[PDB]
Amino acid sequence: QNPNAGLFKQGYNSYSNADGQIIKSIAAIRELHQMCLTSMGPCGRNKIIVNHLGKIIITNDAATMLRELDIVHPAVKVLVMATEQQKIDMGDGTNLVMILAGELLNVSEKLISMGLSAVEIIQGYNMARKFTLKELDEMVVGEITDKNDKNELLKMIKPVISSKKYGSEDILSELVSEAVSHVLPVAQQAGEIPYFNVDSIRVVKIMGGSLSNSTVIKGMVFNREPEGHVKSLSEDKKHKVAVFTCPLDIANTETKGTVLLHNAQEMLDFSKGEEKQIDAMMKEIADMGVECIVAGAGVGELALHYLNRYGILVLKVPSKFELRRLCRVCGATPLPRLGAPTPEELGLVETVKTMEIGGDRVTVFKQEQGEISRTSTIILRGATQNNLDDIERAIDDGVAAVKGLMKPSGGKLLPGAGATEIELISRITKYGERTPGLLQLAIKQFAVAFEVVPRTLAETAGLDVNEVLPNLYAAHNVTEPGAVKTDHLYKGVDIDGESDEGVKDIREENIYDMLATKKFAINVATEAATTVLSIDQIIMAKK
Amino acid sequence: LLNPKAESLRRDAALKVNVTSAEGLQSVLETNLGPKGTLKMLVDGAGNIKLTKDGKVLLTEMQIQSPTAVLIARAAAAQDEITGDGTTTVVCLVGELLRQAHRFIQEGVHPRIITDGFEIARKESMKFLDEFKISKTNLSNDREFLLQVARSSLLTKVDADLTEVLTPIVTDAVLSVYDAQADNLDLHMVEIMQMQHLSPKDTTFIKGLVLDHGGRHPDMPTRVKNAYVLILNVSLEYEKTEVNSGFFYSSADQRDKLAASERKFVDAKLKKIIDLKNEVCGMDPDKGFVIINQKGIDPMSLDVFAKHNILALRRAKRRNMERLQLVTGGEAQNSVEDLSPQILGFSGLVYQETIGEEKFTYVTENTDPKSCTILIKGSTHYALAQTKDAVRDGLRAVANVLKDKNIIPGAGAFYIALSRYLRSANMNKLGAKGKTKTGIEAFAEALLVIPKTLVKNSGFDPLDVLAMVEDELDDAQDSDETRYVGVDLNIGDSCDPTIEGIWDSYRVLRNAITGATGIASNLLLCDELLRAGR
Amino acid sequence: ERTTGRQAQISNITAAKAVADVIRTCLGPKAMLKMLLDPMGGLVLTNDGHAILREIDVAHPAAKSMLELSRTQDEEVGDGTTTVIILAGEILAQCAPYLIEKNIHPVIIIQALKKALTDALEVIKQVSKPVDVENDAAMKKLIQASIGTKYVIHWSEKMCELALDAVKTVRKDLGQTVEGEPNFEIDIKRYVRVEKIPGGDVLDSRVLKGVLLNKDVVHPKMSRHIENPRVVLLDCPLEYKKGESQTNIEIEKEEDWNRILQIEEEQVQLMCEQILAVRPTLVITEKGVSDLAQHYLLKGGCSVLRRVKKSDNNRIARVTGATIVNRVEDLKESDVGTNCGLFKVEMIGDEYFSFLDNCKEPKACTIMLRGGSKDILNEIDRNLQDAMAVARNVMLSPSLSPGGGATEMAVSVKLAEKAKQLEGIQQWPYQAVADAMECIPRTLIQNAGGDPIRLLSQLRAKHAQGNFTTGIDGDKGKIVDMVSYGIWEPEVIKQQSVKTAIESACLLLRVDDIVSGV
């Protein structure tokens, strides 16, 4: 009975600012903003998400939660894409980008309520972004000299692991540093030539024990049974290793070549052919000095018997990625054919052995003197699968962060635990006060948006924000007997948890953040906030 | 008066429906006018989010239920093949003109008189446009005016920050692609590329072409200077039969004998290829050699080329081959048997770009490429689409301006001046009719929609800035000098478009006015709606 | 389902009024647009009355009858369909009060309608004006009336020239006392069929005295231009001779197949020799021509053309004198190349044609229509058809009636004057028809945008005192004299419109019951 006027596009979902959609989008984004607010900070917490396969997923990474959660509203999709960009380009700071964008939208809601046009809000946000990016250059306190030493690497590794696995940062940082040191080349003070790759370090886990029992391997590790009578090779140096893709069996043509034994004549003929061909191929391979053969497919009975006869290590690697890693480690080239031990294609591995870790035996291909491997493997031990998964995620994040120590602000260090955030708040507030026109309100709101980080740290640690926030403001806003600020200007946000007053200085625990990470996160968050705010109407067509 | 089981609309219902649809479309597209406009998100059921401000994209990719709105959108979008811009202007003009016509009809004015007044006002506006245009200089060194035009066309589609990067690229591409001769302009020689690796702010101008298919070898040259271009159409890779087949051996001798059949032709071609490479640039310093090899290349020949410091590409596109021939000047060799040094071309710096998911080869720095390439970069699909749309719009606008020396100053001066001239001329001449004055005033008021929408999108009140602009126009007309008065969407006060650098296309405005007048006249003449055909 | 009696009459009248209401705005140059809602969501804003009538669907059978009558009028006359429908609907509406409230039997109403039709025809004859068919300028001006608001409005001069040339060329006075003496017996469809040639401008169209063929030579190496062509017309194909029924050759031996091939070659050679016995230069065969026949004809220095239907061969016989024979063996020597100007095959619009133009008019002609696109060709063809229809109406009926509704006002006034002397119950439907005749000027006034009430009364008064020489201007909308403004239309159009409208009204009134069954 109620007439409908003003609608002409379609009865499908459609939103316009005439009904306040500019605030409805922000409210919708808040649903996942609250979700991600509980992840940032050293005292972050994971969440339980059920996969489509009926499995249970528990992780502290907000990006993983977003991936495992259904995204419907385009406004949320914008932030999801921004977070994906942050993860791909930088490898860390997804929580920073998400929370900053959410807070920027929240303050934009207040600005809209005040009556400020979205155009002025966007202009002020852009100006504040430029000011903050320029100021971050002067906020640097320390810097990584790129000595590639474990002690210097830990300085950056430790903060990265924190907020991903709380309480175990000390051991995880040592493990990451040990793994990185095995692959870094002999070089120092060189940020223009890449040396470290994210894939250079592999992470594996073995059930049983605790994190304290974890170790690091100086080469490739295979977690599959060799399926043969040869378990390990001697300690002789420079073992020749042959890599094959065709299964170790009778060699046949590319087309057809199937062997079928139907009757006595065919049985005898095919048995003789298979035995002779396999024996000849194995003898030829052994004569070249090949002590280990790795095949991407299975191994036949006669193949196993002849491999045992010549004492050739037996191993199958159905995973092509593992084959590529082995080839990179030893330099061997995959052989599509059988019985072709070409020296130019055979690799060299100094030591090949089977090692038992926690009751599980694995095969390790490591280099000692020659053909030094550029890859390392991390083995995690623990009786809890959730803890192992969290540790694996933390190790991956640390490995990704380590790759970011290059010239473009990789080594530059900022005071973490919100100290940089408070300094930026003060500077942006001063700039907005200096900035004339309506842009001052937007600059002040952009500054206020940065107050979340200390608030999140205080809340996740169980501290009373009503006391921590004024204490932080006083600590970062002090009056000294002179024209230049002095004393402890690097006070951060402490978690305590047992007993403490105020906050602790950053230098006490050396909690520093990468300049490049923070700068790129701020840029991406501001871009996402501007993109979301710039949409005042959504029109879609029914499928 | 109706047949059983029939649907029809009589009385003023048709007028109400048409006015409602026009107002709805006008409100939908109002916020997309001017550099301060908003962005709309479109999802065509696939769930992909696309952001754009172009009127054609908004109208064509959005579902419209009202039949009148469908026709209005189609008519507005049809201008893309005539001028390439002004769709939103056409829609806003149609909406406001229909609103004014309905307002006058409520007073008893017949639609036919309104249509006649619209025609008279259209003729007067054409005369005003003729008397108001400025003849742009044809000097090829006017890079400043081209940059101003590109900035004006781009600011409507970008966030006002990527302008500083995109404007120079588009302006330089359009200036270079036009030969130093009368001839004509053809944007088909300007290629646009999209890459998902870097941010949109990293976009740059490419002087030549980029090749996607290349060889792979650790020793392949990375940078080549003063390189000769050789295009070859004969395969340089091992080939097998259509049915799966291969060579099987049981000994080294059999291996070599069977591989001889595969490698014979490759070695025969490589012999003459290397002979040619030695003949030209074999010992000449500060020179390079690049071979296209449109056909595929096997790893053995790639290694052979690498050991000879030859940048070898494979599986090149036919279109890219033709563009190389037109750019580098090299010819395509059907068979190496007739290989000769005359086939060799010449090119400047040749280098490869390595990306995580792909690789590219640059053949830029040619003596006379007679072509340009623009590389678009981004991290998201919507950003890339917006950048592509903006680049295409800027290219078309600059090309049209170069083709047509007539330029109309922007900043809202044109519409305000047109309205004032229409009002004054029709009040003085009184040559159409007393009642037609209703339609004349309707057209005059409707033509002010564009500046009002531009002011509204910028957050300023039209009632003040438009009044100030009117006062400045009166002062200028009283003065003996010629001056253009517009609206500054950034400061809020009045400004001179000819000094700030805001311009509008003559053809865009002319065609937009004509289309808006035609659509309004056609729609106002609809009296009843009849349903038939099912 | 079923309706009878007064309810059936009311339903029929309502259906007629609904049909009339569709095209009330489709009259005059100021005709307004109508919204046609497509079931697929489309919309067409066409203001053409006949298109709307053909596209608007109706349910009541009377509406279907009216649509069929309008379609028939579209063929009988080139204009007045909307006038016919509007007049019929208004006549039916005006007779409704007398039919229902006054309990007047349909027979009396039908008789009154017939008498009113006779009187209206007499009045239309009275207010007619003679036309001098020998005045080219007057004919061009009259033809320009239907060229208004047409794609060829700019080339109206050349359009009128071509239309007049084509009409005069195909004129057939047929003076005699057996079947009467027609004026010109003009038939565009048969004597002025238009051939569409891609390419060229509007003004490039010409009237050619000859036959145009769209088929080119059958072999790349063959004569293409002949100054003095000699055409041979035949229908039987040149191939292996077969019987009068189905023939199938099923041979498994190569020798017999070779014998059959030799027989086919001999038969084709004999047929080609028979054709060439008359020393021809062009062979036109309706059916297919085998490659052997083409080679044999070419070796004789004679071109070959195939796949030409009888519709073209019959005309070719008129402009070349060739005799069409079904069978090759029956070909005669009467074939001549006389009365043929050329065989030029000039290419127009990247399409090859063949021209047989001459310097004589065999009571027929073909218009070489040219244009930039097929749509332009169709538009120009329709405009030329309209112009030639107007010319035919003027020449066959050299009489004009005043336009702008003046004729309708005069008819209404004279009918009102005469009704007083009827002295019978029939006077009521007579006055109803007289009043309904006034709808056309009312519609014109409404479309123009003036006062629909006072202007009509002024028109009536002026017609009463102005000798029926006043009307409504399309633009000004005031009462003006038609003589000064030159607003005239053919008398035949008005006569046919009135006849059809009154006949439709009588037909719809005569039906008082509708029943179902099959």
UniProtKB/Swiss-Prot annotation, chain A:
GO terms for molecular function: ATP binding; ATP hydrolysis activity; ATP-dependent protein folding chaperone; unfolded protein binding. The keyword ATP-binding applies. GO terms for cellular component: chaperonin-containing T-complex; cytoplasm. One of its GO terms (biological process) is chaperone mediated protein folding independent of cofactor. Keywords: ATP-binding, Chaperone, Cytoplasm, Isopeptide bond, Nucleotide-binding, Phosphoprotein, Ubl conjugation. It holds the Pfam family Cpn60_TCP1. There is a cross-link at residue 9 (Glycyl lysine isopeptide (Lys-Gly) (interchain with G-Cter in ubiquitin)). PROSITE patterns: TCP1_1, TCP1_2, TCP1_3. It comes from the Eukaryota. Coiled coil: none annotated. InterPro entries: Chap_CCT_theta, Chaperone_TCP-1, Chaperonin_TCP-1_CS, Cpn60/GroEL/TCP-1, GroEL-like_apical_dom_sf, GROEL-like_equatorial_sf, TCP-1-like_intermed_sf. It is found in: Cytoplasm. The modification Phosphoserine is found at residue 499. Heterooligomeric complex of about 850 to 900 kDa that forms two stacked rings, 12 to 16 nm in diameter. PANTHER family: CHAPERONIN. Molecular chaperone; assists the folding of proteins upon ATP hydrolysis. Known to play a role, in vitro, in the folding of actin and tubulin. In yeast may play a role in mitotic spindle formation. Belongs to the TCP-1 chaperonin family. NCBIfam families: chap_CCT_theta (TIGR02346). This is T-complex protein 1 subunit theta. The gene is CCT8.
Curated annotation (Swiss-Prot), chain B:
GO terms for biological process: chaperone mediated protein folding independent of cofactor; protein folding. InterPro entries: Chap_CCT_zeta (IPR012722), Chaperone_TCP-1 (IPR017998), Chaperonin_TCP-1_CS (IPR002194), Cpn60/GroEL/TCP-1 (IPR002423), GroEL-like_apical_dom_sf (IPR027409), GROEL-like_equatorial_sf (IPR027413), TCP-1-like_intermed_sf (IPR027410). Heterooligomeric complex of about 850 to 900 kDa that forms two stacked rings, 12 to 16 nm in diameter. The keyword ATP-binding applies. Belongs to the TCP-1 chaperonin family. GO terms for cellular component: chaperonin-containing T-complex. It comes from the Eukaryota. This is T-complex protein 1 subunit zeta. The gene is CCT6. CDD domains: TCP1_zeta. It comes from Saccharomyces cerevisiae (strain ATCC 204508 / S288c).
From Swiss-Prot, chain C:
PANTHER family: CHAPERONIN. This is T-complex protein 1 subunit gamma. Heterooligomeric complex of about 850 to 900 kDa that forms two stacked rings, 12 to 16 nm in diameter. PROSITE patterns: TCP1_1, TCP1_2, TCP1_3. GO terms for molecular function: ATP binding; ATP hydrolysis activity; ATP-dependent protein folding chaperone; unfolded protein binding. Keywords: Acetylation, ATP-binding, Chaperone, Cytoplasm, Disulfide bond, Nucleotide-binding, Phosphoprotein. GO terms for cellular component: chaperonin-containing T-complex. The modification Phosphoserine is found at residue 245. Its main location: cytoplasm. It is found in: Cytoplasm. InterPro entries: Chap_CCT_gamma, Chaperone_TCP-1, Chaperonin_TCP-1_CS, Cpn60/GroEL/TCP-1, GroEL-like_apical_dom_sf, GROEL-like_equatorial_sf, TCP-1-like_intermed_sf, TCP-1_chaperonin. It comes from Saccharomyces cerevisiae (strain ATCC 204508 / S288c) (Baker's yeast). Molecular chaperone; assists the folding of proteins upon ATP hydrolysis. Known to play a role, in vitro, in the folding of actin and tubulin. In yeast may play a role in mitotic spindle formation. Disulfide bonds join 359-365. Belongs to the TCP-1 chaperonin family. GO terms for biological process: chaperone mediated protein folding independent of cofactor; protein folding. It comes from the Eukaryota.
